[PDB]
């Protein structure tokens, strides 16, 4: 019953403020066992929680010291969801953001600070270069062990910014096998990844591959027919 | 093996300011005993009152005080009130553990005194039949709850064979109490007379029965 | 806050061990630890020890190490006491009690007793009570009925299947060689008896045995 | 809130091996530690909490204990989908994580070559990717080729993370070049050498025959 939906632009300039949102899904933000909590993922920092908010008879707010004088992480009982505001941010400041409840897991009744529903995260890259959406080109089956065998076929993304860009195939219908490689950063400053599928050969007369892909930030989708 | 004491009972009127003590058989009651103590209510209901010596717990009226007296802990009840009645304990803190006291009886006069009433009944012909007797001395209706029986064989008195059940509360808020006078078929046919003696606040109440009226 | 709510009454012959439960319920924002306290004859109030339930420390009392064991299970909220080789003296009220950052004791379970008697299941005698029939002279009359050598407790005893409830006075139980005897007794008005059916309604459960009896000069 | 010691900080074990790993807190707080299974791309998962405690719908073989400051998750049996990043907790303080890699069979990569495509040559550039498929051991490696000549740069790699099947991995490498330059060479190459292969593997294809 609990959801957690994270919102908001994962690129944030320098020196600007971070914004993001969760909004909870089965069970009040006010909830007398609801504990609300914003936590982020680096490689530099590892797993590290920033704050919480919760109601008890009034709001209160905790944040860790490394964010104490920038963050601030304010409840909306109107629309039953949380904020985080992060200020004057900077490449440091790049990583997943997670929001997560605490207070539902208790021992002998007493909230413990275990996370026991999260958020999907919402990849955050400080920087002050522009979005850009990116061009999908097919890499096609080769003529190799087509009258019986295996194939491979996929696209190919590039020139993108900020991350991340989804990939799906036949719009979930088709998983099986399926590669989708961690994005590259050329040195132009974009992104750019693969994404690739082994299917029987004698499925390349009778089935269509399309990969799906989606790059939220700059509100672009594509559907790419992949064919001999 | 800390021995803590407290007074065993005590009996007041409602308004009067009554203290109870908390003492340590190590030596004297300090800050670093963190007195505390519970309330048990009839119906074995504890609720707790003072904590960290003179630290009221929510909900206690302001009545109840904490202190250190001299060398031993003490509750004093400004204004006792009928409500007041209780069992009072206090435990003390040893470094690592508490030491509970025996507890303070305490009775708040509630009520109009009442005079014990006492029926006597004989043996009956049945329980005879298997050789055993037993008179059954029922104590009904007093006030305050402080009853002594004792039994008169012949006009003479008894040692043994009796058991007297404590008092307990009775629908009208009053207290009974019955005691048995447990022979055995031979002894009740060796004497005529018997009787059952009640004390109360000073006045005694009895009932006699003979077995030549049986 | 957290209401605690202990396990049922206990019947043991002397040798065996026991387990008391009290199990946690409701909310605490302050974390808190259980302590256990022993009452016998019903004023004689003993510190067993206690369990954190938060660090998992346990303390006893000198007295209860190696007699009592404290655990506690977190994923159900229940905290555990075991006795080992239970004595008439283990015969109690155990309670378990919340004592939190102030360090008074501010919720306790209800209690539980425990009984430690090598006495077998033994149905009560019942007997009736009337008066001598020379004191039969007076406005009211007061009856009874003896129930003599019951274990265990308890016996229910009602009157006229519990149609007579008023002028009725059941007494508690006195320990008579390891078996209970008890009695209750009724006032009704001269004019009432010998002329009405007065009979009480004596039921021991733990040996499926319910008895009547009637009473007559 | 220094990230807590987690000891290992990286193993790798066979299916059905015994796996312990140790967080070195600073207190014995056993109520309010924790540990959370993270698959890629996935936020962590609460796995055990107050030291032994089951999450909803965590298997049995996942158990946890402590022991003074010490606290343990164990895997009594290892299964394939248990790859993850592994990270104890305590209060408001995570531990720094303990990566977990299955150890199967040799198993050699499935090599595949693709050219540019049309569409993507009009714009100006040219990629051309190499695919190594279901592999390991992790450590493949890829020679670029032009007209038979080594490239010593103009590609990157990427690796996948270990499949939560089959516990193999998957590499792409792609050699980026501009059209001009594409259209100055015939053959393409991209050679593989990994340990489940005898000798190198080469795919190849030549320009414009593609
Ligand atoms: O010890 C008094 C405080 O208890 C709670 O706070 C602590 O424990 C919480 C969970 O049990 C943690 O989330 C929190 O970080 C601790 O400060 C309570 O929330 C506080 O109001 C009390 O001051
Ligand atoms: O990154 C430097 C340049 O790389 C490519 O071009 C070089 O490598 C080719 C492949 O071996 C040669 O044919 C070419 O002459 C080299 O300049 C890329 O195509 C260039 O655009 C880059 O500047």
């Known amino acids: 019953q609990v959801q957690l939906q994270q919102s908001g632009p994962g690129l944030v300039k320098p020196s600007q403020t971070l914004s993001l949102t969760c909004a909870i899904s089965?069970?009040?933000?006010?909830?007398?066992?609801?504990?609300w909590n914003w936590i982020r993922q680096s490689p530099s920092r590892g797993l590290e929680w920033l704050g919480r908010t919760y109601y008890r008879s009034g709001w209160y707010n905790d944040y860790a010291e490394s964010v104490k004088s920038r963050i601030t992480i304010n409840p909306d009982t109107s629309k039953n969801q949380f904020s985080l505001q992060l200020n004057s941010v900077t490449p440091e400041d790049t990583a997943v953001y997670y929001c997560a409840r605490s207070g539902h897991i208790t021992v002998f009744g007493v909230n413990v600070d275990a996370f026991d529903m999260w958020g999907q995260g919402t990849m955050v890259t400080v920087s002050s270069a522009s979005t850009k959406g990116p061009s999908v080109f097919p890499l096609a089956p080769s003529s190799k062990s087509t009258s019986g065998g295996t194939a491979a076929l996929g696209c190919l993304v590039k020139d993108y910014f900020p991350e991340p860009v989804t990939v799906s195939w036949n719009s979930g219908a088709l998983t099986s096998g399926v590669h989708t490689f961690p994005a590259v950063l050329q040195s132009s400053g974009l992104y750019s990844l693969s994404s690739v599928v082994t299917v029987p050969s004698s499925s390349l007369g009778t089935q269509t591959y399309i990969c799906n892909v989606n790059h939220k930030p700059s509100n672009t989708k594509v559907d790419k027919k992949v064919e001999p | 093996q800390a021995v803590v004491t407290q007074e065993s009972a005590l009996t007041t009127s409602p308004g009067e300011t009554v203290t109870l003590t908390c003492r340590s058989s190590t030596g004297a009651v300090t800050t670093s005993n963190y007195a505390n103590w519970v309330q048990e209510k009839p119906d074995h209901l504890f609720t707790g009152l003072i904590g960290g010596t003179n630290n009221r717990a929510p909900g206690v009226p302001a009545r109840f005080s904490g202190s250190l007296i001299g060398d031993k802990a003490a509750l004093t009840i400004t204004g006792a009130q009928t409500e007041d009645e209780a069992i009072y304990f206090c435990a003390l803190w040893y470094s690592n553990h508490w030491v509970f006291g025996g507890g303070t009886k305490l009775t708040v006069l509630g009520q109009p005194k009442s005079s014990p009433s006492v029926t006597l009944f004989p043996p009956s012909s049945e329980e005879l039949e298997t050789n055993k007797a037993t008179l059954v001395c029922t104590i009904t209706d007093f006030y305050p709850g402080v009853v002594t029986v004792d039994w008169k064989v012949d006009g003479t008195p008894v040692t043994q064979g009796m058991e007297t059940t404590q008092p307990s509360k009775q629908s009208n808020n009053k207290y009974m109490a019955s005691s048995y006078l447990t022979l055995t078929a031979r002894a009740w046919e060796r004497h005529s007379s018997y009787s059952c003696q009640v004390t109360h606040e000073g006045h005694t109440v009895e009932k006699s029965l003979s077995r030549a009226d049986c | 806050e957290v209401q605690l709510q202990e396990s049922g009454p206990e019947l043991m012959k002397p040798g065996a061990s026991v387990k008391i439960s009290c199990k946690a319920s409701g909310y605490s924002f302050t974390s808190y630890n259980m302590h256990w306290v022993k009452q016998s004859h019903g004023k004689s109030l003993e510190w067993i020890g206690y369990i954190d339930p938060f660090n998992d420390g346990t303390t006893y009392n000198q007295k209860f190490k190696g007699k009592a064991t404290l655990t506690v299970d977190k994923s159900s909220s229940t905290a555990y006491m075991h006795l080992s080789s239970l004595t008439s003296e283990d015969s109690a009220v155990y309670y378990c009690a919340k004592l939190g950052p102030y360090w008074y004791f501010d919720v306790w379970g209800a209690g539980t007793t425990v009984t430690v008697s090598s006495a077998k299941t033994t149905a009560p005698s019942v007997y009736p009570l009337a008066p001598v029939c020379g004191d039969t002279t007076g406005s009211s009359v007061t009856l009874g009925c003896l129930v003599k050598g019951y274990f265990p407790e308890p016996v229910t005893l009602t009157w006229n299947s519990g149609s007579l409830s008023s002028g009725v006075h059941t007494f508690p139980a006195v320990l008579q060689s390891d078996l209970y005897t008890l009695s209750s007794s009724v006032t009704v008005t001269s004019s009432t008896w010998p002329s009405q059916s007065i009979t009480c309604n004596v039921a021991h459960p733990a040996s499926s045995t319910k008895v009547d009896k009637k009473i007559e000069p | 809130d220094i990230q807590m010691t987690q000891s290992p900080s990286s193993l790798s074990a066979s299916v059905g091996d015994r796996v312990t790993i140790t967080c070195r807190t600073s207190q014995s707080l056993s109520s309010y530690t924790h540990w959370y299974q993270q698959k890629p791309g996935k936020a962590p998962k609460l796995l055990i909490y107050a030291a032994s405690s089951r999450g909803s719908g965590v298997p049995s073989r996942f158990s946890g204990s402590g022991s003074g400051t010490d606290f343990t998750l164990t895997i009594s049996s290892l299964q394939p989908e248990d790859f993850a990043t592994y990270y104890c907790?305590?209060?408001?303080?995570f531990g720094q994580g303990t990566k977990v890699e299955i150890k199967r069979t040799v198993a050699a990569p499935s090599v595949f070559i693709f050219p540019p495509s049309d569409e993507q040559l009009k714009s100006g550039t040219a990629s051309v990717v190499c695919l190594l498929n279901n592999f390991y051991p992790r450590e493949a490696k890829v020679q670029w080729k032009v007209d038979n000549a080594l490239q010593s740069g103009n590609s990157q790699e990427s690796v996948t993370e270990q499949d939560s099947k089959d516990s193999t991995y998957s590499l792409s490498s792609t050699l980026t070049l501009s059209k001009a330059d594409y259209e100055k060479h015939k053959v393409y190459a991209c050679e593989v050498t990994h340990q489940g292969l005898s000798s190198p593997v080469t795919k190849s294809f030549n320009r414009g025959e593609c």
């Open positions: 089965g069970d009040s933000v006010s909830s007398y066992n609801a504990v």
């Open positions: 907790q305590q209060s408001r303080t």
